[PDB]
Design a binder for this molecule. Structure first.
Ligand SMILES: Nc1nc(F)nc2c1ncn2[C@@H]1O[C@@H](CO)[C@@H](O)[C@H]1O
Ligand SMILES: Nc1nc(F)nc2c1ncn2[C@@H]1O[C@@H](CO)[C@@H](O)[C@H]1O
Lengths: 331, 331
């Protein structure tokens, strides 16, 4: 129980800040991946496209919360080049005061290849991200008050745990969102990010990976968190309570599958924005699913637009008139 | 039957010319790759290292042939930046006169991630490589005479077929070395690169991929080529005749597994250098296996050194005194 003043109703987004290089492979990764050679892959994809966009899970989530009108602070480490990216985020209402700017290292670089089925294979070079372990959430809280929620996104692995530990000692609600880092983190490293989480967000592959590496059963996890949110690709999203009462929300149907980078980030930002505005779980995931498909339909993670009238119409189309009106009249 | 003069005894190396960005993932790709999610991977590897080196299969193979004292012409397409890379290759005796230099596009970029087991996942952005389809082997042959062998390495996909067709009409012996491009090429595209090949080079994963995508059986392939050369990772290499008489040569034992990029290229260059100097199949693969391990033990594809005394000693250690003396006294 923390006695410091409430920031109300700020979300602090911790996680990576990067430049994304996105490329397309005009074939199927699946069609390359012989089950008997998966022991030691040797894969090389000739790509037909290369474009650069602003990225990082924390930049992506902060951007979307800001577009949706939310109060949001971005907390992460970037290189000296961050000034321009800061202007882009500030233009959508993102508070960038607490971004650590490295004196010597470069903003992180994500290099990603997407195939015809929206499968993705990517590397992430941390650069200045590694200095996120030097950021103190206590100093952020000192300046802006207690956030209603701290999102713990993929980050410098040590920073992910330090931030989570700080939330636990400061009594801040947090969302465990280790998604993009699950590959790098040991089972021990994953296990220590989970206990006491207000929300755990993953996709279903990531959920299997988590359980696979933690040695946990679903029951072991559900006993430690307030809510599991597991996106299911074209099958929508499951929201599961410790009970486990399950609410399911199907996707908003896409007009294209352009580029799936940042779709999870957008779902999380829309959903949490919904939750912050007092919408229930079903309605929050419906708003999330819309921001998600808007990202899927654009190239890059922050290259989507927010048209209030177009949103209501689409929400109506997929979820009906009640959902649409409840959502739009919360924004 | 071509009546033009012999270049004697030049190898023309066709294939890619690039800058390689090599990174290391301090984990296991296998441990990430759930058999039930291989239908649509979502993989992202936080890397702990990023270094840049000269690359491209044709640059790598030309470099090695030149280091070994062979006469070699490099034939491929590069950007205006190629002048510096040209000096590096020329320093090892590589003829770069027939490299097409793009007026507008950039030298190709390879971005590669290697895990603790030497597995590798990579993208390749072609840039100027796409202009290789405009190179005429006839003009190269015009200038330097008929090569004893043209290597058809991974390249602009259309260029790989055009070059092969030119070899077929000019009556030039060729080695089909589609390795790195097998992922991008359709079964139809692979099938038209094979007929009449003096050598077909792949690793065993690539051999399975080839057979998988061509719809061919091993017998279908062996009926069209003079020799199949299939590297087997730590198990060495099989050299198989249409018969199919098989010669097997085990690896030269490594002192490190540093970086496996370019190991296949080096094996091919050493082997073909052996063949050009009148060594038999077994002895040529023994020389190949040595250049291969020298690459494995260094970072980058062209960052290995050639010490004549160290070579004899190592060859002696793995293959015995006869092999070593026969090989060294051919160079
Ligand atoms: N391994 C990773 N670690 C961290 F910290 N961030 C990563 C990783 N992989 C992808 N990203 C970022 O996530 C994407 C959108 O979800 C992109 O915007 C990208 O910048
Ligand atoms: N898909 C590909 N297409 C082409 F033409 N070249 C590629 C590809 N993947 C890797 N490389 C190059 O091969 C490596 C060494 O074998 C490296 O030096 C690298 O430059």
């Amino acid at each position: 129980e923390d006695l410091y003043f409430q920031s109300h109703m700020t979300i602090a987004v911790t996680g990576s800040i990067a430049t994304d290089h996105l490329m397309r492979f005009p074939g199927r990764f699946s069609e390359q991946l012989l089950p008997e050679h998966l022991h030691k892959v040797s894969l090389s994809f000739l790509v037909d496209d290369l474009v650069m966009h602003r990225g990082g899970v924390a930049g992506n989530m902060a951007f979307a919360i800001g577009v949706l009108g939310g109060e949001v602070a971005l907390v992460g480490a970037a290189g000296a080049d961050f000034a321009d990216y800061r202007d882009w985020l500030k233009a959508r209402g993102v508070n960038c005061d607490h971004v650590l700017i490295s004196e010597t290292a470069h903003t992180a670089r994500f290099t990603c290849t997407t195939d015809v089925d929206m499968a993705q294979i990517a590397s992430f070079y941390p650069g200045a991200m590694s200095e996120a372990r030097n950021i103190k959430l206590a100093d952020v809280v000192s300046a802006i008050g207690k956030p209603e929620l701290v999102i713990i996104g993929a980050n410098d692995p040590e920073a992910m745990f330090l931030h989570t530990e700080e939330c636990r000692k400061l009594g801040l609600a947090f969302a465990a969102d280790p998604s993009q880092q699950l590959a790098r983190l040991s089972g021990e490293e994953i296990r220590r990010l989970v206990n006491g989480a207000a929300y755990l967000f993953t996709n279903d592959y990531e959920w299997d990976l988590l359980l696979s590496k933690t040695g946990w059963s679903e029951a072991d996890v559900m006993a430690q968190i307030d809510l599991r949110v597991t996106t299911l690709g074209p099958k929508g999203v499951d929201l599961v309570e410790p009970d486990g009462t399950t609410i399911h929300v199907g996707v908003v149907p896409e007009t294209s599958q352009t580029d799936p980078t940042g779709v999870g980030d957008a779902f999380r930002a829309g959903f949490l924005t919904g939750r912050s505005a007092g919408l229930g779980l079903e309605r929050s995931a419906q708003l999330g699913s819309l921001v998600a498909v808007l990202v899927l339909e654009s190239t890059g993670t922050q290259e989507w637009q927010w048209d209030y009238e177009a949103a209501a119409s689409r929400l109506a189309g997929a979820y009906g008139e009640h959902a649409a009106a409840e959502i739009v009249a919360v924004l």
